[model samples]
Target: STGSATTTPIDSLDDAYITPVQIGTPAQTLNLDFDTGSSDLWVFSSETTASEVDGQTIYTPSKSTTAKLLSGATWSISYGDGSSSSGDVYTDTVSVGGLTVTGQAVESAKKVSSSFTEDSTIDGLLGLAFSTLNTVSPTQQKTFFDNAKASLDSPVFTADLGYHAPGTYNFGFIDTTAYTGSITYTAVSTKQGFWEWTSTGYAVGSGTFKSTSIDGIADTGTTLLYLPATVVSAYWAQVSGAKSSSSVGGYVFPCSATLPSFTFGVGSARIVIPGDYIDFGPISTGSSSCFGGIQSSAGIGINIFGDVALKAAFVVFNGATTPTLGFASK
Candidate 1:
C-alpha cells in the first residue's frame, strides 16, 4: 500500500479550497483551508470569546478525552489581507484525508479579526508550509504533515487546485496519472520559511519569451498571482484600456476587453495562465468592470505564485532532503 490520502475540495468557497480535518478523541470534523503561505493550524474554538465567534464553528477541547493544554503556549498570526487570529494551544490527534497524526498541536482561537469571524464557512487554516514557520511560542508546533511524513511511504504531497472545478490534495505519494509530459523539477530555497524560488521570467500572451528572474513563493493560501510592480505594469500595458484603478487598488479593465494569457518559465517548460482565469470576477453585480487576478507584489516583501498560477498545472511539494517544487501540465 502507498499509505496515501486524497483531500477533496469544499464547494462553499470557490477561491479558498478546504479539506475535512478530524481533531481530538471523539473526532470533531472541521473544514480547514490547506494554506501553504503560512504555518499554523489555527481554528475557531471553545476558547474563543463568545462575542468574537459570531457564527463561526468552535472546537471544544473539553469534549475530547485526549486533549491536553500546553501551559504558557500561545499563537498569533497576521495575513496579507490584514486578517489575523490569536489563540491558545492544545495537544490532540489530528487527521486529514485517511492519515492520522497523534498529539498534534492544535491552536484554538481565543481572538480573531472580524474577517475571520465573518468567514463562517472556513473553520480554520491547516498550514502545509515548513514547520519552522509555525507560530506556537514557548514550544513551536509541528504541522500534521511534518509529524506524519516519517511514517509514510514517501515524504511528499501534491497540490491539484482546479479552476471552477473539483480538485484534490494527495499526500505521501505522487500520482503519476495526475499529470502529463515530464515533470520539471526546480530547487526550492526556504531561507525565509517559504517555498521561495526565482522563475526564469515570463511573457504576456503569445509574445516572445523574456528571460529575467523574478523572486517569489508558491503560496496556495493566496488567491491571485502577484508579481513585481514593473512586471504587473508590463502585462497591463498589453491590454487595451487596462489601467491601475486607485479606487480598486489594482488593475481593472472593461468586462468585454480581449485579455491575454500570462506565461511563466520553469526550467525549459512554459506554464501559461489562460486569459479567462486572469479576469478574476466582476467588481460589482451589475458593473461592466472586472478585476485582474494578477497584481503587484511590491511592498508585500515577495511575489506570490498563488492559485491563479497554481491551478494551471500539477504541483509537487517534495519534502525529503533538499525540498523542491515539480510542475507539469495535467
Candidate 2:
C-alpha cells in the first residue's frame, strides 16, 4: 500500500516580472508547446492556413532572408485530441529576453488546429522541463536545449508563472527573493518530467492533504490532477450519496454535494484539490460528465499532475544546471 502519511517541504518565492523572450527572429516569429510531459519544443508555422485558430504568436518564415528551412526536416504531428500540425524544421537566431540563442531548431507549422494557435500571450513555449520523450526521435531527437545547452546563461531555467498575464512566459535565471527558507531539492530522475502522486485515503470539504503523497510525475503541460486507479476508485467509493457516471472514459459524480474531500501529503508538502476542481468543466447541456482530473495510464511512461495541482502550490522548474534539474522556491 502506498502509505498515507507525509511531511513534505514546499518553499515559496516572490517572483519578479521579466520581459517575454523571443525564441526566433521576426522573419518567422515561431510558436511552440514547452511541454514537460514530453521533451520537445513544438511551434505552429506559416505553412498552415485555413480556419480561424487562436494561439500564442504565429510565425511566418518567409519574412526573414536569414531563416533557413532545412529541406528534408518537414513533418507532421497528431495529438490525442485528434488534431495534427505539419511543418518543416528550421534554424535561426533567438533571444529569450535579450539572451541570444544561435542556430535554434524550430518547427514551422504546415497544418494543425487548436485554440492554442490563438492564445497571443503565449505564442510559443520553451520546454525547459526534463523528459525522455521526444517527437524528433529516430532522426533528430535532440531538444532545443540539448543543442543550445552550451550557450545557456544558467545550467537550468526557472518557471515563474503569474496566471494569465499580458506577456508572461519569461525565462533565464531565477530570482533569489522568491522564497525565505531553504529550497528543498529533490533528486531528479528520468521516470517522467513531473512527479506522479499516489494516495492511501481521501476526504472532501476543508480537509488537508496531511495523508497525501506526491511522488509520481509533475507536468506543467497538463491541466488536471489525474489519479491512479486505486486512489480515485476509493475516493469515488467513499463519496457519500454520490453516483458515478461514465464520461470521457472516466468516472464523474453527478451530485456536487457528494464530492468528497481530498488532500494528500509527501515529505513536508501538503496538496488538496478544491471542491470546484471536482466540479470539472462547466456543464454542457447534452453532455454526460466532463471532469478536469482523469485516470492514469501507469504505463503511459509520462504521467503528469497538471495545472490543477500547480494552482494549489508554487512550483519551480530548473534548467540552469547541465544535465540536471534544480528544484527551488516558486
Candidate 3:
C-alpha cells in the first residue's frame, strides 16, 4: 500500500526495546505476514501464475539488488485454515528495520491458495512459529534470523507487528541501548511447538456445542481468536446473563460490564487473557457485539489467539536457544 518503504534500524528482542538503525546494503527485501503460528520465511515469486497462487502478493526478485534461485527442491504447505502454497526454495540477502539477514532462507512460491490467496493482505509470510517448520532447504537455504544475528551490529531482533492496526506488522532490531541485563530468553520445543494451550479443551455455550474448550492455537494470521463452549461460558460467567446465538458461531455477552481477566495455568506458570482486547463483531444472528477477542469455533481446531491475546502478553521464541519454550501469556 505504501509502495515499499524502508524504516530505521532496530535491535533484536534480546535487547527488550526497539531502537533506530541505518539501512545498509540494498540487496533485496520482502513483504511478509509476521506469523507465530508456523515457522518459515515465505516469499511470493514473480514466476508464479495468476491461476495457481490466487490471493498472494507476487515477489519480483528482478527489482532487488541480489536474488538467487534455490536451484532445486519444491515445497507445498497446507494449513488447517485451508490456506496453502507451493513454491521453490531460494536464497538472498534480506533485511528488516536496519538489519540484514544475509543468505537467508526464502521460499518463493509457484502456487498459492486459500485465505492467504483470497484475502491477499501482505506480499508473503514471515512465520515465527517454530524453526522446526522452517521452509528453507538444507541444500540451498538460510534462515532469516540466523543471518540477521550473524550480521547485525546489535545482533538482536524485535517484531513491532502493528497488530493495533489492521495491516501494520513491523519488524526490525531492538535498540541495544534500552536493555540492561542478559537476554532472558526462552528456548523452543518442537513436539508441542504447535500450541501451548492453557485449557478448556472443548465447546460449551447456548449455541450447538456447550461443553468444550474449543481447543485452539494462538495464531497471528487468523483474524479472530475463537474458543469452544466451556471457555466461552466460563468467560461469560463474568458478564452475567450472556446468551448464545446458534447462527452467530458463539455466544454474546454485555459489552459495558467489567469483564474479568482470565488466567491460564500451564504446568509451571500462569498466563492471563485480558478482557479489554476482546474483539466483538456484529453477530450474524443478532445485533449485539458478543465477545470480540473470543469467538466460537465454527467447526473446531485451529482456533487462534489473534492480536488481543498476543499484545497483552510477552511471547519469546527460542530460535536462538533450545527445545524448552516459555509462554508468559498464551
Candidate 4:
C-alpha cells in the first residue's frame, strides 16, 4: 500500500507545515504538523479544555464508533520551543492520504500550552520519528508511520517541503519526478531517536568547501537551520550590516543587505540554499532589520537541519532494519 499527502506551509516564514489527517470512523479531518523530531500522534480533541481551545478543529472520539479508549494510557510532550500538551490515549482508525491503519494510537489533547492555543493554523502534531520516542505511558504507542509501515510497499517515506507553496509527503515509494540527480544516502544513528547524520561540511556563497564533520538532525518540526557558531558567524559576516543582537535573539541584518547562499555536503553531493531563503524576514513588523534563517546551535546543544535546509532538497527517511537517510536535489 502507498499514500501521498500535501503539506502546506502555515505562515509566510514557513514556520510550520500542516497536512490533513483522517481520524476515526466517519473521517474527521484535522490539520496536523508532520513532525520528524518527535514521536507521538496527538491531536486537539473534544476532551480538551474549553478555555484552552481557540480557532482550531477538534477530534470528537465519542462520535466515532471506531474510537476506543486505551484505558490507563496517557501521554505528555514538550518541545524545544517550550510548547507542550498532555492527553489521554485512544485507539482508532487513522488515515493519511489514502493509507489507512486500524487501531492506530491517537492521543487526544486535554490541555495545551498558550503557544499551541494561539496557533489557529495547527490542530496538533503527527510525529514521524521513531516509535522509541513515543511519550505514551503505561504502554508505549506506535506512531502512525510505524503501524502503517508493514502494509506499505516499502519501509520508507519522503518529505518534499516547499518554500512558500505546498509540498508533498509520500509513503511506500519514492516519486522520481520530485527530485533530480541521484539520491545521496547516509547512515542514520537512531540511538538519539532522531534522523541524525553527519554532514561532510559546509561553505559560504561561492566559497571553498570546508572539510569538517558536522553532526545534526533533520527536523521538519523546527523552523530554522541551526549549525555551529563558527559556521553561523562566517555566513553572517559575509552580509554587510549584519550583527548578532541579544535583544532580537541571534543574527539580524538590514533587509536591504545582500544575503549569501549556504551550501552543505551530503557525501559527495552538495545542496545549496538560496540567498533569499537565508533572509528570514523582518525582525519586527515594519522593521528594516531582518532575522536570519541560519543561526548558531550552541545554545540548542545539537545542530538542527530544519525546514530552511530541508526545503532546499528532497529528504527520505529510510526505515530499513539499518535505517538510513537519503538526500536529493529538487
Could you estimate the TM-score for every candidate?
Answer: 0.95, 0.69, 0.66, 0.99
**Ranking by lDDT, best first?**
4, 1, 3, 2
Each model's lDDT comes to 0.86, 0.48, 0.49, 0.94
Q: Which 10 consecutive positions of candidate 3 have the poorest summed lDDT?
A: 8-17
lDDT of 1 by residue, 99-160 (tens): 88888999999999998777777899999888999999979989877888888788888898
Q: Which stretches of candidate 3 lie over 4 Å from their true place?
A: 1-29, 51-57, 135-142, 147-188, 192-218, 223-229, 240-246, 252-260, 265-272, 284-291, 295-306, 323-330
Clashes of each: 0, 51, 33, 0
Model 3 agreement with the true structure over 40-115: per-residue lDDT tens digits:
6776678776665555446666665566666776666766557787778765666555445556656777777745
Q: Give the alpha carbon lDDT tens digit for every residue of 1-330 in model 2.
A: 000111111111111122333554453444344455555555655565645345445666666555677667755555433545556677666555445566766666665566445444444444544434545433554555555555555544444333222222333444566544444444455554333334333444464433544355556555555666556666666555434445445555553344554564434544455555455543355554444344453444444466445544444455444233333333
Choose 1 or 4, whichever is better by TM-score: 4
Q: Per-residue lDDT of 80-180 in model 4, one digit per residue for the tens?
A: 88889999999999999899999999999999999999999999999998999999998999988899899999999999999888999999999999999
What value does the lDDT take at residue 327 in candidate 4?
Answer: 97
Report the number of the highest-TM-score candidate: 4
